[PDB]
Amino acid sequence: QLKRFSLRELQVASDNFSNKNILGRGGFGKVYKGRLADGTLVAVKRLKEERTQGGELQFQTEVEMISMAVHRNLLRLRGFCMTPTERLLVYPYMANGSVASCLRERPESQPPLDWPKRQRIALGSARGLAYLHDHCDPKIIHRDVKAANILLDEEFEAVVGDFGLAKLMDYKDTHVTTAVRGTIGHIAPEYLSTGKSSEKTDVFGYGVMLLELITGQRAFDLARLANDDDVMLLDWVKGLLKEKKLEALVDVDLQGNYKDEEVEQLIQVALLCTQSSPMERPKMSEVVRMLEGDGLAERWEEWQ
Amino acid sequence: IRVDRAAMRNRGNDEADAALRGLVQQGVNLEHLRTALERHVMQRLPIPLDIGSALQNVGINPSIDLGESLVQHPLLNLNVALNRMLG
């Protein structure tokens, strides 16, 4: 059973949803920080007041997904609340917020996200995905892999967070026909053009997420820059990697505190992951081995 | 109230085809159009005012301004309907 909260319980946990408690905002609604009766910290997602079908599909999906995936690198839905007027989902509080929240959209003078901490995120979040793809039956395509959906606990361990857009796929299928859903810039070209997704769209989304992680910027910010040179984002990044103009890419906020070889290898994973050819795109478990140490230089050689 | 994912998906495919029918009706350049839609949806390249109106005419509102998570969008549905028609 999944804990069903009363609206009042969450009202009290949140101080009647005080603005002092807001962690995130969007068209979807709001996320409040909360504390339960037993001192448990939580994040409460209050959906917008308008009962459109998008939110509803997402709400039902997150709820159903509760018993299909369990893993230390996946955020687990602790509960829900459903009054006529209200839709709420409850999660474990993540002390250090979204990865995106730490990346230059970070408020005020919050301390920059150290490089070794970014490598840890890349690894942990890759494990969560590998799990969704290889060890769930049916396979789960997350379909919304991006910096905003990676939460960090007090030890900065990475947790992949939002399953509203998730898609079950038969373990044996190579694809499943479904509407194009996701975040612009994180949706795979083949999926965009055919409406046929697979785990490989997640890999592509992950690859872009890494660009966010290396750059410190949203996929949207990046796109504009690539255009300025009137080049496609991926040819732009690839071009910078090849010409050693990497200074142009790396999160300036990192100052310079990073090994030039480490960052490059991470960019390489990114590019391998975002290849237009899904079959050449590595499995997420291969990415995990790659990030751990094994197999990168070889796979990157097979690139050219 | 159980939401039907298939129905939602069917409606988007239908609103998109009705929209594509109109664009073919209005002599819009389609192999032309693939490009504006592809470059918009991937690279977030800003949509031409030329065609913004043409889409607005067909009821498809430019444009995917948000960097938010899309459960669906008319532009994405349309882009799929195009590629079906042109291999």
CATH classification at residue A239:
1.10.510.10
- How far, in Å, are A48, A126, A223, A247, B44 from residue A230 at the CA level? 39, 31, 10, 20, 13
| Residues A43 and A120 placed together within one structural domain of the fold | no
Query: Can you count the helices (H) and strands (E) in chain B?
Result: 4, 0
Q: How far is A106 from chain B (nearest CA, A)?
A: 17
Method: X-ray
Last residue of a domain, one of A39, A72, A93: A93
Cα four-point dihedral sign A148, A116, A124, A272 = positive
Residue of A nearest to B64 (CA): A184
A245 annotated as belonging to a binding site for a ligand? no
Last residue of a domain, one of A75, A93, A111: A93
Q: Which two tokens stand for residue A98?
A: 């979204």
Backbone phi and psi for residue A79, each to the nearest 5 degrees, phi listed first = 180, 175
For A225, left (φ over 0), alpha (ψ -120 to 50), or beta? alpha
Chain A residues whose C-beta is within 8 A of a chain B C-beta are 26-28, 53-58, 60, 144, 148, 162, 164-165, 178-185, 187, 189, 192-195, 218-220, 223-224, 226-227, 232-233
| Residues A84 and A100 placed together within one structural domain of the fold | no
- Residue A226 CA to residue A208 CA, distance in Å, equals 14
Q: Are strands A158-160 and A196-197 parallel, antiparallel or unpaired?
A: unpaired
Q: How is domain B1-87 classified at the CATH fold level?
A: Monooxygenase (1.20.1280)
Q: Do A219 and B80 touch (CB under 8 A)?
A: no
| Residues A240 and A187 placed together within one structural domain of the fold | yes
| Residues A72 and A104 placed together within one structural domain of the fold | no
Q: Are strands A3-4 and A79-83 parallel, antiparallel or unpaired?
A: parallel
Last residue of a domain, one of A42, A69, A93: A93
Containing structural domain, residue A235: 94-304
Q: Do B83 and A193 touch (CB under 8 A)?
A: yes
Backbone phi and psi for residue A230, each to the nearest 5 degrees, phi listed first = 45, 60
Bridge partner list, A4: A80
Q: Which two tokens stand for residue A108?
A: 């005020």
| Residues A238 and A162 placed together within one structural domain of the fold | yes
- The ranges assigned to domains in chain B are 1-87
Based on the residue annotation, tell me whether A294 is a catalytic residue of this protein.
no
Q: Which of A114, A134, A144, A221 is catalytic?
A: A144
Query: Can you count the helices (H) and strands (E) in chain A?
Result: 10, 12
Q: Where are the alpha helices (DSSP H) in chain A?
A: 7-14, 53-64, 115-134, 189-194, 199-215, 219-228, 233-242, 260-273, 284-292, 296-301
- Kindly list the residues from chain B whose CB atom is less than 8 angstroms away from the CB atom of residue A220: 44, 67
CATH classification at residue A5:
3.30.200.20
Closest by CA position to A36, among listed A17, A9, A66, A71: A9
A150's CB contacts (< 8 A; 6+ apart) are: A98, A99, A100, A121, A125, A158, A159, A160, A161, A209
Q: 3-state DSSP helix/strand/coil percent for chain B, to nearest 5?
A: 60, 0, 35
| Residues A74 and A117 placed together within one structural domain of the fold | no
Q: Which two tokens stand for residue B43?
A: 């690279």
| Residues A173 and A47 placed together within one structural domain of the fold | no
Q: Do B9 and A144 touch (CB under 8 A)?
A: no
| Residues A65 and A214 placed together within one structural domain of the fold | no
